[PDB]
């Protein structure tokens, strides 16, 4: 086959479910406020 | 009761007719002794059925090895003799560089 | 004409040239050696029609209508299921020492000894055959209740299947159900206390 | 020794005149056949094997000439064959495939192989896979050039020819010798 | 039909290449340059 | 290659880039014995007794 | 083969101070001949424990398979099926391994069909 | 066997570092790589297989190889016509497509938030 | 006899037109006519040398013992080694239809097939396929069709709703052999 | 499955998210203080295949679209287990055809009914 | 020759990465769901418009108040249509011709109409206000979200003035409140009314129906370029324009004469006069085998006496015919003119099989004027989505594929499972051809579902429950890639000012309500 797979560079084979590099690691380190409710 | 269906009734004149049509369709089956043209026994209908099913789904060892060679690229020699037998087998080994 | 309706059933062109032979010869021997009316030719053409129609009707009613309900046959699978079921009851007939050569028993057993037994594909006539055989077998294997009437071939063959039957009245029309309910609850509310 | 450049460089030898002569002799040939045939009276000569053979010859020649004629095989000649009523043979199709391929038109060539695969499969020779191979090598699609060799290895029939391996190997060296753009050329 | 006549002799010439899509440079000859660059050179004014 | 922050501003690829794989791969030769093709059969008699 | 190639190649771009092993397990046709490894009755003399002492492996035994002659000289008063009944095979077989020859004279060398008993 | 449990050829790569997270991250990298190379190869074999399934001839040689037995299961030398043999071939190729699709489909699951290898 | 077989298989069994006149010329009654005939029809191979090689089998001399076996052998070998004979011994194949994509799109897989003058008698005068915009297209999922749309009357459904696309399914090929044979069977019935 | 996927992802140079209509002219923003107004593009000029003179979208400063052949990935839909509508050319040859029991009795388009009819 | 230098451009991933780097996470282009706890991998990506919004013209570009919620409800209706479809086995077949497509869509429509909409699958993506059916109805009108009674009334009626705004009576004497699944033929019948055409922004349809498309002249010039043309050259330019326009409008005229080739009379012909639609039956001759055709309103008595098995044969003018088994159709008599100035009577059915003189690709253009040609009704949401469905089927992006663990198998999912066949004689197991079945339950946790994995499933055929190996199961894939290939891609509302958007940190999902 080709040395570098067609699925890498060809936009017809583009994978829409993929996400950008930065987004996930930004949403990952989020610590949400732990007082969601009164009393606890 | 609208969904319920009557179980049909099949007669040996019909079954023999069909069996003949099959006989003509695959001549070599009658030749090689897969099936016979005659319906004599009560159990021969089912019996010929099973013989068909076995001829179709059973693969002779030489044929199996060759076919597995074709599209799966299974490597090895393959004996075409009566006195040779093709054993499908696993080979493990290690590589280190 | 009778031998012709039955014998050539599964190749229609062959049957056709054969019928054409039969009545073209009956018509040669009709032209000379016959006499003062044309009725013989009309009865021979009507005999061509009658023969043809009896054949077409035979393959209609004794084949096509038996086969045509696919859901009944479980879309080809009931047909297979029944098969093994049959083979399971009758093993002292099909696979036994007295019954068959060890070569065949070994071929069978070797087919069944695979990790997944994949049901082999089949030619059209073989399909018709297999179906017919296993219908006629499902005759015997089933309970005495469903012998005549059931929904589906395979029905009852295996004793313990867990079905989804759980709604008795959902098949009925809403209007009837509704009127019934209003009436009945009107009465229970206007009648008792507990 | 590139079997493709053989055709292309052969088109420069008085290609046009040779073409015109192949056409002329062809019309001559149909005249002759119609004479020899004179029950399928309406269908003679065109319904005969001989006729087919002659058309095959015409095409096989037209491949040798200049671009215009190569490009006119799958276009004019084949349509005229259908029109006329002459039934093709495997060589007809492998010739048309070869024509389309030399043009660099893959979509159509592979469509043809697909047709042949579906209906007529038991007649397929290797020169078809040779056609497509050479073809992809022209259009410079080397992954399809790969795909077809791998497939032709799997089904071991029809047998590959030393020409086939010549084509695929050539394709490899071609791919191997091409540069990328500047972004990937740094290291 | 009749050998080497008008319609046959027309069909022999193949597909007609339009002068619209023809890429013709300064000297009236098909261009040396890549299709994108030519497309860009001859691109309409604004 | 186009990334000017590469080792300087702290960007270090987590996945080794395709180009680089292609190069490292292109540099070393492939052993011929690693292909593993046997169409003949095992040599029973001679093979183990071959020249010293 | 190509997958194996990329895979053996991953050792070249492997990470810093990291090494690797390759375990391959594939499927391969082996071939059992009843010709070279025939299925025969036990000898009419048995083998004792004695054939097995230490260094009996280096002395009292050959390395299998044993060498059977595929070539045989025809004795004088013989005919095709005298030779065939001698070699333990059908006449047809003997004729086919030897297909070259139409007749077998005394003192001639012949090809034993490998399925002979 | 179907799905995960079975294959023609199994490769095991054993990666070894001096530090744990080294080999872990390494495993992620090599794994992603073989996911893409894997998809590529298996895809190609899939298009080959699909073509093969659409139609094709049968070897004289394969046919011969089916017909070599003195006596097949029905107790006489059996005639496999080229039809039947093509039917076997076709069955197995259908199976191969199942397995190709299995692998390819698995390759496309591990997306960035969802990756578990 | 091969010509005969092919022409009979072409119809799926009478005789097709395919066997009426074949590519091989009748031999003149002479020795020189023979050598010449072999020369022009089979002459890419060297035939004399192949007839020499085919002489001996397993030490046995075939020419001086079995005539017909030697004959069938030299025949087979010249048959196999020549590309010319291979080209002329071929089987008639049906003729593939070119196609255009639909004017009203439903499937990409459903295409309008070109139709030869032979298959539709009647039909308006038409050009050749390529001039009309038909091309080679095929795949596993292909289906071919004759395309038209239902006639809208005068009603709301004509003016507002889109055109309704009536298809009539056709074969992807054209059997020239089967057609010719069938029509000459029609001429043997009429007469 | 984007809307107008080709006109945008495959056909447009930026995947739609680079705005090619932009002036490189000097800007008064604090962060844009490095920006120098550009000379107009070179008129008759031959670029490198990965670039452009930056005039338009049709001609970007950086060319993203590959110049090779584009082929959308091979479907992961089962070609085997799917059953299409019967064609004509299938119904002519129906007598020679080999199906699965699911193919003859298939719920939609059963072939057995056709074969008998 | 340009392919001599292989240019792999920058992959799309790299582009998106650079973009979202230059923007420091680009919060403008993110979905609001990205800013709430544990966003799923679909909320992790940018704001691209998907294909689901393509048939809804009610919301124009800025959707007004409640529009977006309405649309979301339509979208869910279509997802349920798809589920019903896979369920009873009528889905796009990659091969299918238009007649089979028509039959199929029809059966699907009936099964839709008779099934209650499911609200438990009604889900709310970020910022969307939850609303009941009833609110949507009383605001937008009931015709838009029809009760089965209104569906029935529109399919079984005629008149235009009735577009039913408010509810209808029911057999029980109540106002009918049910939400059944939307059905394409209904939406067609609504596209037939003028009021509706205007409501959905298609009002232009009234003016533009029979007219030509506006001529598009290749290389048309501005006045700014034309100012440099010489008098002669300008004359030439005019020559060009005139000839193009003339040609195109003439092409429209010729095409909309709507003429077809009559093979019998060897001529082109066209329709002068329409009769009403008659029900028609076919009568086959007994002796000759010839086939005739008969208006069922004329012979009604005799035909109905044959349907009662009393007299089994129908004589006409001395020739007796047998009634064909079904052959009961609706056909229109047509008065057709020939270019000889001739007149015939031909059925609609047979005049339909004919070949057209003109078939230009823009015939349906009038339906979207100036916007691209479509072969389907683009005012119908359901039919548009169905068209898309069929396209992506035929392309092979959509279809039956061996299931993965990640594809989101869950209760209620339509599935094709290979029916396990039970034999004692068999070690291991026996597999058989795929049949349609619903998932009853699927255990994800490795400890409820050991290897090899199982799925409890109910086969539609006999209504049977079984445990099936997951490697034996196929699902309907919406797209190539996954992880979840069973579920469709959902567009989100576009926000003009993205930087001002607010998340309540205490109840992000707005669960206190």
DSSP for H51-84, written as a single string: HHHH-----HHHHHHHS--SS-TTSS-----HHH
Beta strands in K384-477 (DSSP E): 399-402, 414-418, 429-431, 434-441, 454-459, 464-469, 473-477
**Helix, strand or coil for residue K479?**
coil
Partnered with residue K283 across adjacent β-strands are: K292, K323
**Helix, strand or coil for residue K395?**
coil
Q: What is the resolution of this structure in A?
A: 3.4
Among J60, A16, H55, CA closest to K10: J60
Put simply, whether F48 touches G (Cβ < 8 Å) is yes
Q: Which residues of I touch J92 (CB under 8 A)?
A: 171
Helix (H) or strand (E) holding C194: none
Distance (Å) from the alpha carbon of H52 to chain F's nearest alpha carbon: 23
Q: Provide the number of CB pairs (under 8 Å) joining chain B to chain D.
A: 6
Give the nearest chain C residue to B18 (CA atoms): C129
According to DSSP, the β-strands at C149-150 and C122-123 are unpaired
Conformational region of residue K176, where left means phi above 0, alpha means psi within -120 to 50, and beta covers everything else: beta
For chain G, breaks with the C atom over 2.5 A from the next N come after none
CA distance K283 to K314: 8
Task: Indicate the burial class of G86 (C-beta count within 10 angstroms; 0-12, 13-18, 19 or more).
Answer: middle
Give the nearest chain F residue to H30 (CA atoms): F15
Q: Which chains touch D (3 or more CB pairs under 8 A)?
A: A, B, E, F, H, I, J, K
HSE (CB half, 13 Å, CA atoms) of D179?
A: 11
* Chain-chain contact of G9 with F25 (C-beta, under 8 angstroms): yes
**Residue K46 token pair:** 């940018």
Among B29, J96, B70, CA closest to H62: B70
Distance (Å) from the alpha carbon of J19 to chain H's nearest alpha carbon: 27
List the 50-109 stretch of J: residues with Cβ below 8 A of A: 65-66, 68, 70-73
Give the nearest chain A residue to F17 (CA atoms): A4
Those residues whose C-beta lies under 8 Å from the C-beta of residue B17, and which sit 6 or more positions away, are C6, C9, C10
Q: What per-residue string of b and e applies to K37-56 under the rule 16 or more CB within 10 Å gives b?
A: eebebbbbbbbbebbbbbbb
* Chain-chain contact of D179 with K3 (C-beta, under 8 angstroms): no
**Residue I115 token pair:** 């139709």
According to DSSP, the β-strands at I99-101 and I110-113 are antiparallel
**Helix, strand or coil for residue K337?**
strand
According to DSSP, the β-strands at I110-113 and I143-147 are parallel
Among D95, D93, D161, D168, CA closest to D136: D168
CA distance I190 to I170: 28
Among K330, K335, K356, K331, CA closest to K346: K335
CA distance D24 to D27: 5
Tally Cβ neighbours within 10 Å of residue I166.
Answer: 20
Among I137, I87, I133, CA closest to I110: I137
CA distance B96 to H14: 10
Q: Which residues of B touch G68 (CB under 8 A)?
A: none
* Chain-chain contact of H66 with B70 (C-beta, under 8 angstroms): no
**Residue J63 token pair:** 């060319």
User: Do K30 and K126 form a contact (C-beta atoms < 8 A)?
Assistant: no
Q: State which approach was used to obtain the coordinates.
A: cryo-EM
Nearest CB to G24: which of B82, B85, B93? B93
Put simply, whether C69 touches J (Cβ < 8 Å) is no
DSSP state of J58: S
Those residues whose C-beta lies under 8 Å from the C-beta of residue J97, and which sit 6 or more positions away, are C123, C124, J90, J111
Tally Cβ neighbours within 10 Å of residue F29.
Answer: 5
According to DSSP, the β-strands at K414-418 and K278-285 are unpaired
CA distance K50 to K490: 7
CA distance H109 to I1: 60
- Do the chains H and G touch each other, judged by at least 3 C-beta pairs below 8 angstroms? yes
CA distances from I105 to A1, K91, K103, K364 (A): 35, 18, 17, 11
Put simply, whether C173 touches K (Cβ < 8 Å) is no
Helix, strand, coil fractions of chain I, as percent rounded to 5: 40, 15, 50
User: Do J13 and E36 form a contact (C-beta atoms < 8 A)?
Assistant: no
Q: What per-residue string of b and e applies to H45-65 under the rule 16 or more CB within 10 Å gives b?
A: bbbbbbbbbebbbbbeebbeb
CA distance K133 to K120: 13
Nearest CB to H47: which of D147, D155, D156? D147
* Chain-chain contact of I169 with K97 (C-beta, under 8 angstroms): yes
Give the nearest chain H residue to G17 (CA atoms): H17
Q: Which residues of B touch D154 (CB under 8 A)?
A: 70-71, 73
User: Do K474 and K401 form a contact (C-beta atoms < 8 A)?
Assistant: yes
Put simply, whether K352 touches I (Cβ < 8 Å) is yes
CA distance D74 to B81: 48
Rg (C-alpha) for chain K, rounded Å, is 30
Helices (H) and strands (E) in chain I, counts: 7, 8
Q: Which residues of A touch H112 (CB under 8 A)?
A: 18-19, 24
User: Do K200 and K57 form a contact (C-beta atoms < 8 A)?
Assistant: yes
User: Do D128 and D91 form a contact (C-beta atoms < 8 A)?
Assistant: no
Q: Which chains touch C (3 or more CB pairs under 8 A)?
A: B, H, J, K
User: Do K376 and I162 form a contact (C-beta atoms < 8 A)?
Assistant: yes
Partnered with residue K477 across adjacent β-strands are: K399
* Chain-chain contact of D181 with J69 (C-beta, under 8 angstroms): no
User: Do D46 and I179 form a contact (C-beta atoms < 8 A)?
Assistant: no
* Chain-chain contact of C64 with J107 (C-beta, under 8 angstroms): no
Helix (H) or strand (E) holding C29: helix C12-31
Of K407, K471, K478, which to mutate for an interface test with H (greatest number of H Cβ within 10 Å)? K471
**Residue K149 token pair:** 């009674």
CA distance C74 to J105: 8
- Do the chains B and C touch each other, judged by at least 3 C-beta pairs below 8 angstroms? yes
CA distance K381 to K188: 10
Among E7, E2, E4, CA closest to D20: E4
CA distance I146 to I114: 9
What contacts 24+ positions apart, CB below 8 Å, involve D72-78? D72/E11, D72/E12, D72/E13, D72/E14, D73/D99, D74/D99, D74/D100, D74/D103, D74/D108, D74/I136, D75/E14, D75/E15, D75/I130, D76/E11, D76/E12, D76/E14, D76/I128, D76/I130
**Length of chain F (residues):** 52
CA distance C57 to C63: 10
Distance (Å) from the alpha carbon of I56 to chain G's nearest alpha carbon: 11
Distance (Å) from the alpha carbon of A8 to chain J's nearest alpha carbon: 12
Omega prior to I105 cis, within 30 of 0: no
How far from chain centre, in Å, is Cα B30? 14
Q: Which residues of D touch B68 (CB under 8 A)?
A: none
Tally Cβ neighbours within 10 Å of residue H94.
Answer: 18
Nearest CB to E34: which of K2, K218, K225? K2
Q: Provide the number of CB pairs (under 8 Å) joining chain F to chain G.
A: 29
Nearest CB to K41: which of H101, H105, H113? H113
Q: Which residues of J touch C9 (CB under 8 A)?
A: none
Give the nearest chain B residue to H42 (CA atoms): B72
Give the nearest chain B residue to F41 (CA atoms): B77
Distance (Å) from the alpha carbon of B90 to chain H's nearest alpha carbon: 9
Strand order in the sheet with K434-441: K399-402, K473-477, K414-418, K434-441, K454-459, K464-469
**Residue I49 token pair:** 């040398």
Of J47, J53, J63, J64, which to mutate for an interface test with E (greatest number of E Cβ within 10 Å)? J47
Distance (Å) from the alpha carbon of I173 to chain J's nearest alpha carbon: 8
DSSP state of I166: -
User: Do A19 and K41 form a contact (C-beta atoms < 8 A)?
Assistant: yes
Partnered with residue K279 across adjacent β-strands are: K330
Distance (Å) from the alpha carbon of J78 to chain I's nearest alpha carbon: 12
Helix, strand, coil fractions of chain K, as percent rounded to 5: 30, 20, 50
* Chain-chain contact of C108 with B50 (C-beta, under 8 angstroms): yes
Put simply, whether C150 touches B (Cβ < 8 Å) is yes
* Chain-chain contact of B77 with F37 (C-beta, under 8 angstroms): no
Query: CA angle G35-G37-G39, nearest 5°?
Result: 90
Put simply, whether J2 touches A (Cβ < 8 Å) is yes
Helices (H) and strands (E) in chain H, counts: 3, 1
* Chain-chain contact of E35 with K225 (C-beta, under 8 angstroms): no
Partnered with residue K321 across adjacent β-strands are: K285, K314
**Helix, strand or coil for residue G21?**
strand
Among K487, K484, K482, K440, CA closest to K464: K440
**Residue B37 token pair:** 């043209």
Put simply, whether J72 touches H (Cβ < 8 Å) is no
**Helix, strand or coil for residue C122?**
strand
């Amino acid at each position: 086959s080709a040395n570098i797979p067609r699925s890498v560079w060809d936009p017809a084979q583009h994978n829409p479910n993929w996400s950008d590099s930065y987004g996930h690691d930004i949403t990952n380190r989020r610590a949400w406020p732990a007082r969601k409710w009164t009393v606890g | 009761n609208m969904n319920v269906v009557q179980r049909p009734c099949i007669e040996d004149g019909l079954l023999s007719l069909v069996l003949e049509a099959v006989t003509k369709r695959h001549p070599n089956w009658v030749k090689a002794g897969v099936i016979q043209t005659t319906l004599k026994d009560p159990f021969d209908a089912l019996r010929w059925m099973m013989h068909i099913f076995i001829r179709l789904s059973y693969v002779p060892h030489a044929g199996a090895a060759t076919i597995a060679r074709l599209s799966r690229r299974r490597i090895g020699p393959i004996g075409l003799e009566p006195h040779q037998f093709n054993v499908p087998a696993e080979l493990g080994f290690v590589e280190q560089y | 004409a009778e031998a012709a309706v039955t014998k050539f059933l599964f190749q229609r062109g062959s049957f056709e040239s054969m019928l054409h032979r039969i009545i073209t010869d009956a018509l040669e021997k009709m032209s000379t050696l016959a006499l003062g009316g044309q009725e013989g030719n009309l009865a021979l053409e009507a005999l061509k029609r009658q023969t043809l129609f009896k054949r077409n009707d035979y393959i209609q009613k004794r084949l096509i209508d038996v086969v045509s309900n696919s859901a009944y046959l479980g879309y080809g699978d009931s047909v297979w299921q029944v098969f093994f079921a049959a083979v399971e009851a009758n093993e002292e007939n099909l696979l036994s020492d007295r019954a068959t050569t060890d070569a065949i028993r070994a071929a069978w057993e070797g087919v069944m000894r695979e990790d997944v037994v994949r049901l082999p594909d089949v030619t059209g006539v073989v399909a018709l055959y297999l179906t017919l055989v296993c219908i006629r077998e499902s005759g015997r294997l089933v309970p005495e209740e469903l012998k005549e009437l059931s929904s589906g071939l395979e029905d009852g063959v295996r004793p313990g299947v867990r079905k989804l039957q759980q709604y008795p009245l959902i098949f009925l029309h809403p209007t009837v159900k509704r009127r019934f309910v209003v009436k009945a609850v009107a009465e229970i509310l206007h009648n008792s206390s507990s | 020794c590139d079997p493709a450049l053989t055709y292309k460089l052969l088109g420069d030898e008085n290609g046009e005149e040779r073409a015109q002569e192949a056409y002329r002799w062809f019309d001559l040939a149909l005249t002759s056949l119609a004479v020899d045939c004179g029950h399928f009276v309406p269908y003679l000569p065109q319904g005969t094997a001989a006729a087919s053979h002659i058309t095959n010859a015409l095409m096989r020649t037209l491949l040798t000439c200049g671009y215009t004629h190569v490009a006119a095989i799958p276009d004019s000649v084949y349509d005229r064959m259908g029109s006329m009523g002459i039934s093709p043979t495997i060589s007809t199709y492998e010739l048309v495939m070869l024509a389309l391929s030399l043009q660099g038109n893959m979509v159509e060539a592979e469509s043809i192989l697909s047709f042949l695969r579906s209906h007529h499969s038991e007649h397929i020779t290797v020169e078809s896979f040779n056609a497509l191979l050479l073809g992809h090598r022209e259009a410079r699609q080397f992954d399809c050039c790969d795909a077809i060799w791998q497939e032709l290895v799997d089904r071991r029939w029809p047998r590959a020819s030393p020409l086939t391996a010549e084509l695929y190997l050539r394709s490899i060296m071609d791919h191997a010798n091409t540069p990328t753009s500047e972004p990937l050329q740094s290291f | 039909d009749t050998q080497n006549d008008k319609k046959q002799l027309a069909r022999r010439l193949g597909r007609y290449m339009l002068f619209a899509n023809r890429s013709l440079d300064d000297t009236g000859f098909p261009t040396d340059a890549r299709a994108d660059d030519y497309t860009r050179w001859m691109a309409p004014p604004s | 290659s186009h990334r000017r922050d590469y080792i300087r501003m702290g960007y270090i690829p987590r996945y080794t880039p395709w180009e680089w794989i292609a190069i490292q791969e292109a540099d070393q030769p492939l052993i011929a014995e690693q292909i593993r093709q046997d169409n003949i059969g095992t040599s029973y008699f001679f093979s183990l007794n071959r020249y010293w | 083969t190509e997958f194996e190639k990329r895979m053996y190649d991953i050792r070249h771009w492997l990470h810093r101070q990291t090494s690797c092993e390759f375990h391959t397990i594939y499927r391969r046709n082996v071939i059992h001949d009843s010709a070279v490894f025939p299925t025969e009755h036990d000898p009419a003399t048995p083998t004792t424990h004695e054939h097995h002492r230490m260094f009996s492996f280096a002395l009292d035994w050959q390395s299998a398979p044993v060498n059977r002659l595929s070539t045989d000289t025809v004795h004088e008063g013989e005919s095709w099926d005298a030779v065939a009944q001698r070699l333990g095979c059908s006449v047809g077989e003997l004729k086919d391994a030897n297909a070259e020859r139409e007749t077998i004279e005394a003192g001639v060398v012949i090809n034993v069909p490998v399925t002979a008993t | 066997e179907d799905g995960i449990r079975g294959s023609e050829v199994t490769y095991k790569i054993v990666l070894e570092g001096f530090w744990d997270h080294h080999v872990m991250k390494l495993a992620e990298d090599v794994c992603m790589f073989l996911k893409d190379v894997g998809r590529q190869i298996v895809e190609e074999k899939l298009v080959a297989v699909r073509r093969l399934l659409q139609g094709g001839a049968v070897d004289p040689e394969l046919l011969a190889a089916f017909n070599c037995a003195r006596a097949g299961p029905f107790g006489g030398l059996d005639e496999y016509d080229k039809e039947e043999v093509a039917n076997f071939l076709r069955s197995d190729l259908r199976r191969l497509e199942e397995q190709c699709l299995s692998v390819i489909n698995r390759c496309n699951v591990p997306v960035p938030g969802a990756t578990n290898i | 006899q091969t010509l005969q077989n092919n022409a009979v298989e072409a119809v799926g069994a009478g005789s097709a037109p395919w066997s009426i006149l074949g590519p091989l010329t009748a031999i003149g009654p002479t020795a020189e006519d023979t050598m010449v005939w072999l020369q022009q029809h089979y002459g890419d191979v060297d035939v004399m040398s192949i007839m020499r090689w085919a002489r001996f089998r397993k030490g046995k001399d075939l020419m001086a013992k079995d005539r017909p076996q030697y004959l069938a052998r030299a025949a087979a070998w010249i048959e196999l080694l020549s590309k010319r004979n291979r080209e002329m011994e071929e089987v008639p194949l049906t003729y593939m239809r070119k196609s255009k994509p639909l004017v009203l799109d439903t499937n990409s897989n459903v295409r309008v097939a070109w139709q030869t003058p032979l298959m539709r008698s009647g039909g308006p005068p038409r050009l050749l396929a390529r001039e009309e915009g038909y091309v080679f297209h095929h795949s596993n999922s292909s289906r071919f069709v004759e395309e038209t749309y239902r006639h809208p009357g005068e009603s709301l459904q004509s003016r507002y709703l889109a055109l309704q696309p009536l298809h009539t399914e056709v074969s992807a090929k054209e059997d020239f052999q089967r057609l010719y044979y069938q029509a000459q069977k029609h001429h043997k019935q009429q007469e | 499955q984007l809307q107008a996927q080709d006109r945008i992802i495959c056909g447009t140079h930026g995947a739609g998210i680079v705005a090619h209509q932009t002036a490189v002219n000097s800007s008064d923003n604090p962060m844009l203080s490095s920006v120098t107004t550009a000379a107009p593009a070179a008129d008759l000029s031959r670029t490198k295949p990965h670039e452009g003179t930056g005039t338009s979208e049709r001609d970007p400063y950086i060319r993203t679209l590959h110049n090779q052949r584009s082929a959308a990935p091979e479907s992961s839909v089962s070609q085997s287990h799917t059953v299409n509508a019967p064609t004509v050319d299938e119904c002519e040859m129906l007598a020679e055809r080999w199906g699965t029991m699911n193919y003859w009795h298939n719920d939609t388009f059963p072939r057995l009914v056709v074969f008998l009819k | 020759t340009e392919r001599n230098t292989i240019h792999y451009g920058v992959p799309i991933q790299q582009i998106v990465d650079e973009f979202v780097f230059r923007h420091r996470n680009a919060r403008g282009e993110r979905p609001l769901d990205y800013f709430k706890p544990f966003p799923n991998f679909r909320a992790l990506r940018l704001n691209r418009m998907y294909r689901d919004v393509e048939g809804f013209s009610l919301m124009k570009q800025r959707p007004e108040f409640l529009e977006w919620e309405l649309f979301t409800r339509y979208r869910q209706h279509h997802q349920q249509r798809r589920r019903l479809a896979l369920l009873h086995g009528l889905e796009p077949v990659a091969n299918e011709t238009a007649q089979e497509r028509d039959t199929r869509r029809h059966r699907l429509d009936e099964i839709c109409e008779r099934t209650p909409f499911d609200e438990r699958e009604m889900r709310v993506n970020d910022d969307e206000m939850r609303v009941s059916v009833e609110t949507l109805r009383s605001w937008f009108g009931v015709y838009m979200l029809p009760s089965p009674t209104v569906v029935n009334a529109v399919l079984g009626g005629s008149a235009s003035v009735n577009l039913h705004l408010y509810h209808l009576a029911d057999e029980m004497g109540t106002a009918d409140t049910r939400e059944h699944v939307l059905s394409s033929r209904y939406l067609n019948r609504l596209l037939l009314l003028e009021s509706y055409q205007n409501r959905v922004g298609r009002g232009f349809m009234n003016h533009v129906v029979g007219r030509a498309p506006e001529p598009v002249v290749p290389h048309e010039q501005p006045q700014e370029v034309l100012r440099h043309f010489s008098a002669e050259e300008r004359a030439m330019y005019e020559q060009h324009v005139k000839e193009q326009t003339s040609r195109q409008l003439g092409e429209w005229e010729r095409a909309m004469k709507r003429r077809r080739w009559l093979t019998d009379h060897q001529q082109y012909g066209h329709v002068v006069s329409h009769g009403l639609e008659t029900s028609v039956v076919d009568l086959s001759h007994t002796e000759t085998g010839a086939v005739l055709t008969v208006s069922t309103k004329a012979y009604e008595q005799e035909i109905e006496a044959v349907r009662m098995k009393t007299n089994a044969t129908i004589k006409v003018d001395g020739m007796v015919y047998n009634l064909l088994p079904n052959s009961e159709r609706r056909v229109v008599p047509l008065t057709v003119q020939l270019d000889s100035g001739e007149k015939i009577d031909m059925t609609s059915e047979d005049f339909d099989r004919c070949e057209l003189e003109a078939f230009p690709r823009n015939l349906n253009h009038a339906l979207n004027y100036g916007i691209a040609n479509y072969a389907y009704n683009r005012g119908n949401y359901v039919e548009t989505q169905d068209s898309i469905w069929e396209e992506q089927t035929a392309s092979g992006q959509e279809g039956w594929s061996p299931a993965t663990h990640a594809d989101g198998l869950r209760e209620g999912l339509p599935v094709r499972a290979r029916r396990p066949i039970f034999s004692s004689s068999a070690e291991q197991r026996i597999a058989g051809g795929p049949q349609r079945a619903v998932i009853i339950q699927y255990h994800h946790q490795p400890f409820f579902n050991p290897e090899p994995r199982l799925v409890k499933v109910a086969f539609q055929c006999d209504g049977t429950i079984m445990e099936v190996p997951i490697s034996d199961v196929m699902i309907w894939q919406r797209r190539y890639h996954g992880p979840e290939r069973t579920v469709g891609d959902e567009s989100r509302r576009y926000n003009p000012a993205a930087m001002r958007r607010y998340v309540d940190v205490t109840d992000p999902f707005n669960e206190k309500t």
